Design an enzyme around this catalytic site. Sequence first.
Site, PDB file in Angstrom:
ATOM      1  N   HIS A 130      46.173  55.408  41.343  1.00  0.00           N
ATOM      2  CA  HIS A 130      45.230  54.311  41.522  1.00  0.00           C
ATOM      3  C   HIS A 130      45.442  53.622  42.878  1.00  0.00           C
ATOM      4  O   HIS A 130      44.485  53.280  43.572  1.00  0.00           O
ATOM      5  CB  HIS A 130      45.373  53.296  40.391  1.00  0.00           C
ATOM      6  N   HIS A 131      46.699  53.415  43.249  1.00  0.00           N
ATOM      7  CA  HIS A 131      47.013  52.805  44.544  1.00  0.00           C
ATOM      8  C   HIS A 131      48.480  53.048  44.880  1.00  0.00           C
ATOM      9  O   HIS A 131      49.286  53.355  43.990  1.00  0.00           O
ATOM     10  CB  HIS A 131      46.700  51.287  44.538  1.00  0.00           C
ATOM     11  N   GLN A 172      55.646  52.278  46.347  1.00  0.00           N
ATOM     12  CA  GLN A 172      55.211  51.955  44.986  1.00  0.00           C
ATOM     13  C   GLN A 172      53.989  52.817  44.730  1.00  0.00           C
ATOM     14  O   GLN A 172      53.097  52.883  45.567  1.00  0.00           O
ATOM     15  CB  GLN A 172      54.829  50.483  44.872  1.00  0.00           C
ATOM     16  N   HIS A 225      51.048  53.556  41.843  1.00  0.00           N
ATOM     17  CA  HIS A 225      50.434  53.121  40.598  1.00  0.00           C
ATOM     18  C   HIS A 225      49.655  54.262  39.970  1.00  0.00           C
ATOM     19  O   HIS A 225      48.680  54.743  40.543  1.00  0.00           O
ATOM     20  CB  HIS A 225      49.492  51.947  40.861  1.00  0.00           C
ATOM     21  N   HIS A 231      45.172  39.896  46.876  1.00  0.00           N
ATOM     22  CA  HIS A 231      45.715  40.332  45.620  1.00  0.00           C
ATOM     23  C   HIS A 231      45.728  39.179  44.614  1.00  0.00           C
ATOM     24  O   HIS A 231      46.173  38.079  44.939  1.00  0.00           O
ATOM     25  CB  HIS A 231      47.140  40.848  45.810  1.00  0.00           C
ATOM     26  N   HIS A 234      45.308  38.850  39.910  1.00  0.00           N
ATOM     27  CA  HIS A 234      45.221  39.691  38.733  1.00  0.00           C
ATOM     28  C   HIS A 234      43.804  39.574  38.181  1.00  0.00           C
ATOM     29  O   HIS A 234      42.873  39.217  38.928  1.00  0.00           O
ATOM     30  CB  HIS A 234      46.309  39.297  37.725  1.00  0.00           C
ATOM     31  N   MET A 269      48.344  35.712  40.408  1.00  0.00           N
ATOM     32  CA  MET A 269      48.915  35.663  41.739  1.00  0.00           C
ATOM     33  C   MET A 269      47.750  35.355  42.643  1.00  0.00           C
ATOM     34  O   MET A 269      46.611  35.702  42.335  1.00  0.00           O
ATOM     35  CB  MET A 269      49.554  37.002  42.140  1.00  0.00           C
TER      36      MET A 269
END
Length: 312
Positions: free
Chosen positions: A63-64, A126, A128, A198, A200, A270
């Site tokens: 996804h990312h 990271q 996802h 960013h 949520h 966030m």
Amino acid sequence: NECLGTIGPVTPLDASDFALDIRMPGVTPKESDTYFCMSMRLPVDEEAFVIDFKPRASMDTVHHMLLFGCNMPSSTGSYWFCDEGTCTDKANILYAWARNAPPTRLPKGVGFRVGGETGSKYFVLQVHYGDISAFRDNHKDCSGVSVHLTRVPQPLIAGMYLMMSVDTVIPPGEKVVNADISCQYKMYPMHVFAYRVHTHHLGKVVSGYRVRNGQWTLIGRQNPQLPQAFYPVEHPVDVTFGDILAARCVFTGEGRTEATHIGGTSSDEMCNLYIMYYMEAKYALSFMTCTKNVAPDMFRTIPAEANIPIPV
Ligand SMILES: CC(=O)N[C@@H](Cc1cc(I)c(O)c(I)c1)C(=O)N[C@@H](C(=O)O)[C@@H](C)O
Ligand SMILES: CC(=O)N[C@@H](Cc1cc(I)c(O)c(I)c1)C(=O)N[C@@H](C(=O)O)[C@@H](C)O
Ligand SMILES: CC(=O)N[C@@H](Cc1cc(I)c(O)c(I)c1)C(=O)N[C@@H](C(=O)O)[C@@H](C)O
Ligand SMILES: [Cu+2]
Ligand SMILES: [Cu+2]
Ligand code: NI
């Protein structure tokens, strides 16, 4: 496939350049929306400059991906769940790859400084994983990013200015809650060239501005529900000593039964605006952060678009 082979992760390019492949060590998600983290120490101890990035993602599950620079990864393991953390120290985001919104290349002559005495000693990746269906094969994934490193000093140094909220509280069902952030800028001029937002699920719009002599100049404005890539700035914008950086995230509490505060889970929120910039090498600093709201009253003049949802 594309997994790490007998040739290793370092590709020599010329006397002072090499590419470094940062890939997952063949992992397998067992649940959708799994976030895996891993690290790679820089192979050189002296200062180097990161001047390009090439994604190597699995279009069928990733996804990312985000790549950070830091000095103390959160785990010493081969890979770990990012819920344990990214880095013990404060990680510096360098790159973001978002499915469905292709990244933009760094301007030529611009590079992030790493390694050496004060630069990041590690890269932390990271990844996802969204749709873990393709993992019916129970096969291993080696998604990642390749970085082009050079010893050649760059005339412009890229950095990151992060604006974030820490005290926001979103009462349940509340129609509109604004999270405002503002700081005065006191360094040499920086030119913003890209931005990422960013939040949520409750985030509706995130905007950032440079305010000078009371006038508001847009840096970036985006729906955080859209892919969270770094998007190029519409027009180059300098931020100079004396200016005030101001950002606002618009949230709603609708659909929640309890209050939502700042935090790392899906039930928390966030409010982040990452401003990527370049500075002349002799004046450059690699990172700045604003976690306050120094001029609260200034927001009475924020442009109306800051509260207007972005039309799909
Ligand atoms: C850390 C180190 O020793 N590097 C090599 C040259 C080099 C540095 C970077 I950063 C890099 O991306 C590449 I490709 C090559 C080095 O310094 N070699 C020796 C040399 O140049 O003879 C010492 C004495 O300078
Ligand atoms: C509390 C919060 O807002 N954390 C954000 C922003 C953040 C980014 C970096 I880089 C950093 O070094 C620190 I301390 C905080 C946060 O965790 N944002 C996420 C994001 O922007 O996707 C993570 C994955 O970077
Ligand atoms: C063909 C190509 O990708 N050329 C890049 C070097 C590069 C190779 C790999 I493998 C990689 O993963 C990454 I990220 C970058 C390139 O533009 N190299 C420069 C160089 O060769 O120094 C230019 C000037 O030719
Ligand atoms: Cu994602
Ligand atoms: Cu978050
Ligand atoms: Ni300028």
